Each structure stands twice: as structure tokens, then as C-alpha cells.
Amino acid sequence: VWPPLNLPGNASKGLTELMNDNTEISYEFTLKHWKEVSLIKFKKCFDADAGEELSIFMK
């Protein structure tokens, strides 16, 4: 899915390759751009959770 809630900035190429959910994103494609994305908010979480893996803080 790679669901970013942003990129209103610059790229209609980003628009296409996002709205199609392009499973690939080329590096050479990236090198020709600046400020690709910043998922910057203060709202909620994404693809992660905390309070598990009992090994760490038991060691």
C-alpha cells in the first residue's frame, strides 16, 4: 500500500505513480527531484506498534 498522507507539493508524476500504486519507484527517477515526500503530521500511527518483544526490557 505505502500510504502517505501527503505530497501536495510538486509532482504530478508523483500523482500518477502514487494513485496507480506503482509497486516500483526508480532511484534514477528520484535523483531528478528534490523534496520527494514528508509524512509530517501529529495525528496517528502507521505500519508500527509498541509494547511487545518481551526480550529487550527483560534483559
Binding site: 501536495p8 507539493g9 510538486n10 528534490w34 523534496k35 514528508s38
Partner: peptide, 25 residues
């Protein structure tokens, strides 16, 4: 002449993008 509307649109959105970059700090 009427192409200038989309020209200034994309240019000003690029400018707001630059403003975000400035917010980068």
C-alpha cells in the same frame, strides 16, 4: 494567451513547496 493560468498555477504551487522546504528547520 490563456495558457498563463496553468503556468502561474504550477509556479505558485512550486513556490509553496519551496516555502515548505524553508519550514524544514
Amino acid at each position: 494567451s490563456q495558457s498563463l493560468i496553468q503556468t502561474i498555477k504550477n509556479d505558485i504551487v512550486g513556490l509553496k513547496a519551496g516555502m515548505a522546504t524553508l519550514e524544514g528547520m
